[PDB]
Scaffold this active site. Structure first.
Site, PDB file in Angstrom:
ATOM      1  N   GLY A 167      34.080  11.179  57.957  1.00 15.64           N
ATOM      2  CA  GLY A 167      33.718  11.586  59.307  1.00 15.64           C
ATOM      3  C   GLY A 167      34.612  12.654  59.909  1.00 15.64           C
ATOM      4  O   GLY A 167      34.272  13.249  60.921  1.00 15.64           O
ATOM      5  N   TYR A 174      24.874   9.018  62.962  1.00 18.80           N
ATOM      6  CA  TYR A 174      24.855   7.968  63.973  1.00 18.80           C
ATOM      7  C   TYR A 174      23.423   7.701  64.449  1.00 18.80           C
ATOM      8  O   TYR A 174      22.835   8.536  65.146  1.00 18.80           O
ATOM      9  CB  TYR A 174      25.722   8.350  65.196  1.00 18.80           C
ATOM     10  N   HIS A 185      37.709   8.926  74.416  1.00 19.98           N
ATOM     11  CA  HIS A 185      38.610   9.303  73.331  1.00 19.98           C
ATOM     12  C   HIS A 185      38.720  10.814  73.141  1.00 19.98           C
ATOM     13  O   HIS A 185      37.834  11.601  73.537  1.00 19.98           O
ATOM     14  CB  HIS A 185      38.149   8.662  72.014  1.00 19.98           C
ATOM     15  N   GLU A 187      39.456  13.358  69.630  1.00 19.22           N
ATOM     16  CA  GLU A 187      39.258  13.245  68.192  1.00 19.22           C
ATOM     17  C   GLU A 187      40.576  12.905  67.486  1.00 19.22           C
ATOM     18  O   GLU A 187      41.662  13.105  68.058  1.00 19.22           O
ATOM     19  CB  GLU A 187      38.683  14.544  67.641  1.00 19.22           C
ATOM     20  N   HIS A 273      36.279  12.552  75.888  1.00 20.50           N
ATOM     21  CA  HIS A 273      34.855  12.356  76.148  1.00 20.50           C
ATOM     22  C   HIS A 273      34.431  10.924  75.898  1.00 20.50           C
ATOM     23  O   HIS A 273      35.127  10.155  75.220  1.00 20.50           O
ATOM     24  CB  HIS A 273      33.988  13.307  75.295  1.00 20.50           C
ATOM     25  N   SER A 285      27.701  14.401  62.801  1.00 16.42           N
ATOM     26  CA  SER A 285      28.930  15.002  63.291  1.00 16.42           C
ATOM     27  C   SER A 285      30.094  14.998  62.299  1.00 16.42           C
ATOM     28  O   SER A 285      30.122  14.221  61.341  1.00 16.42           O
ATOM     29  CB  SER A 285      29.381  14.291  64.558  1.00 16.42           C
TER      30      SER A 285
HETATM   31  C1  LIG Z   1      34.937   0.244  65.515  1.00 15.94           C
HETATM   32  C2  LIG Z   1      34.763   1.664  65.911  1.00 15.94           C
HETATM   33  C3  LIG Z   1      35.084   2.832  65.337  1.00 15.94           C
HETATM   34  C4  LIG Z   1      34.702   3.814  66.262  1.00 15.94           C
HETATM   35  C5  LIG Z   1      34.889   5.280  66.110  1.00 15.94           C
HETATM   36  O1  LIG Z   1      35.653   5.733  65.257  1.00 15.94           O
HETATM   37  N1  LIG Z   1      34.152   6.055  66.943  1.00 15.94           N
HETATM   38  C6  LIG Z   1      34.221   7.461  67.123  1.00 15.94           C
HETATM   39  C7  LIG Z   1      35.141   8.262  66.459  1.00 15.94           C
HETATM   40  C8  LIG Z   1      35.172   9.622  66.693  1.00 15.94           C
HETATM   41  C9  LIG Z   1      34.267  10.205  67.577  1.00 15.94           C
HETATM   42  O2  LIG Z   1      34.357  11.531  67.839  1.00 15.94           O
HETATM   43  C10 LIG Z   1      33.303   9.421  68.227  1.00 15.94           C
HETATM   44  C11 LIG Z   1      32.166  10.025  68.967  1.00 15.94           C
HETATM   45  C12 LIG Z   1      30.879   9.517  68.809  1.00 15.94           C
HETATM   46  C13 LIG Z   1      29.826  10.137  69.467  1.00 15.94           C
HETATM   47  C14 LIG Z   1      28.477   9.513  69.451  1.00 15.94           C
HETATM   48  O3  LIG Z   1      28.440   8.292  68.982  1.00 15.94           O
HETATM   49  O4  LIG Z   1      27.483  10.143  69.758  1.00 15.94           O
HETATM   50  C15 LIG Z   1      30.096  11.239  70.265  1.00 15.94           C
HETATM   51  C16 LIG Z   1      31.406  11.663  70.386  1.00 15.94           C
HETATM   52  N2  LIG Z   1      32.438  11.085  69.754  1.00 15.94           N
HETATM   53  C17 LIG Z   1      33.327   8.046  68.010  1.00 15.94           C
HETATM   54  N3  LIG Z   1      34.160   3.288  67.348  1.00 15.94           N
HETATM   55  O5  LIG Z   1      34.198   1.886  67.115  1.00 15.94           O
HETATM   56 MN   LIG Z   2      34.257  12.253  69.748  1.00 13.12          MN
END
Ligand SMILES: Cc1cc(C(=O)Nc2ccc(O)c(-c3cc(C(=O)O)ccn3)c2)no1
Ligand SMILES: [Mn+2]
Ligand SMILES: [Zn+2]
EC number: 1.14.11.66
Length: 350
Positions: A167, A174, A185, A187, A273, A285
């Protein structure tokens, strides 16, 4: 100069021509020359001419190995999200659950209404997110903005060490349903990210300007003192949800944007974000870098409480792109201060 571009640090939206769209790193450098990075988040609508895949009719058999049920606990605009891993299922099986009466989008008029229902029902009827699925839905021949192979300097990590990080320098899919969330969060290593909404209902985003990121962290530490005491970067657990009313109550600057199918979202280093999905959809992504990211990478504050957290060695980046500072840095005496307003050096030609 840079201070005067996007002084409001609002989320910008770009409509590149097909010619502008061909060179990825160049266009990222361009939108930075326009001050887009100050918002922490930008939308890029690709030319109508463009498509990464002819048809999505062949994917109902695709496996989601680790669907996640999102349990949310909290009140008064502050929440903690707990992940319950469910057993594998197909896109077909997921879509069925998603569109079912129990889990489907509620009726509504304006977006503000749907947003209100999100924050009011967050803790009820926990949905399932088909998150972190290794893969890409790009056709192998698409050479523009291909999340599988963007060719930025983030490629130096694998090139140098053979290390792949799922990732981060590989693609994630997703599969969303209504009320599935991504917590506040930045990145990993405070990198850039690119997010493409292949198909389905929208995805709404909140963003906080990098230049105000620290203010959000101070608020977060105040609201979660236990978590702040156990980890030096507890927001990287990606479990913390904070409503826009709460941000507003404490004077944190932020912006909102809604992402439609066929649109790109770019997040910028140290850009906090969060958001949610409106209903059934699918996003792809990965992370990426520019020369500007390197200083961010050197100074990123990482999770101190887990072994399996993402950590990229900065060494190869400082040697190759900051050779005059390598000795100073390795001796812990590099006191460079980051200016969140400046565009990446590649932007010179604009
Ligand atoms: C357990 C567990 C792991 C994660 C994770 O790594 N999530 C993650 C890690 C990096 C990211 O950039 C985003 C994310 C996700 C989205 C989305 O789901 O549309 C949009 C923006 N950022 C989400 N969440 O719960
Ligand atoms: Mn993100
Ligand atoms: Zn931690």
């Amino acid at each position: 100069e840079s201070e005067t571009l996007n002084p409001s640090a609002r989320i910008m939206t770009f409509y590149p021509t097909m010619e502008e769209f061909r060179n990825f790193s160049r266009y990222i450098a361009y939108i930075e020359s326009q001050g887009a990075h100050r918002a922490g988040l930008a939308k890029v609508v690709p030319p109508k001419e463009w498509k990464p895949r002819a048809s999505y009719d062949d994917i109902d058999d695709l496996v989601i190995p680790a669907p996640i049920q999102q349990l949310v606990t909290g009140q008064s605009g502050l929440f903690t999200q707990y992940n319950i891993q469910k057993k594998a299922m197909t896109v077909r099986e997921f879509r069925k659950i998603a569109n079912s009466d129990k889990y489907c989008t509620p009726r509504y008029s304006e977006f503000e209404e749907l947003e209100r229902k999100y924050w009011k029902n967050l803790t009820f009827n926990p949905p399932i997110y088909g998150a972190d699925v290794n893969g890409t839905l790009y056709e192998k021949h698409v050479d523009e903005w291909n999340i599988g192979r963007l060719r930025t300097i983030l490629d130096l990590v694998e090139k140098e060490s053979g290390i792949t990080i799922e990732g981060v320098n590989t693609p994630y899919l997703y599969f969303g349903m209504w009320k599935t969330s991504f917590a506040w969060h930045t990145e990993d290593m405070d990198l850039y990210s690119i997010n493409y909404l292949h198909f389905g209902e929208p995805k709404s985003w909140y963003s906080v300007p990098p230049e105000h990121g620290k203010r959000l962290e101070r608020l977060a530490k105040g609201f979660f003192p236990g978590s702040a005491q156990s980890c030096e970067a507890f927001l990287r657990h990606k479990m913390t949800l904070i409503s826009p009313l709460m941000l507003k109550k404490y004077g944190i600057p932020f912006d909102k944007v809604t992402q439609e199918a066929g649109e790109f979202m770019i997040t910028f280093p140290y850009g906090y974000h969060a958001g949610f999905n409106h209903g059934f959809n699918c996003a792809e992504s990965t992370n990426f870098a520019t020369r500007r990211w390197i200083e961010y990478g050197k100074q990123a504050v990482l999770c101190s409480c887990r072994k399996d957290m993402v950590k990229i060695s900065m060494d190869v980046f400082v040697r190759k792109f900051q050779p005059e500072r390598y000795k100073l840095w390795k001796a812990g005496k590099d006191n460079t201060v980051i200016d969140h307003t400046l565009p990446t050096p590649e932007a010179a030609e604009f």
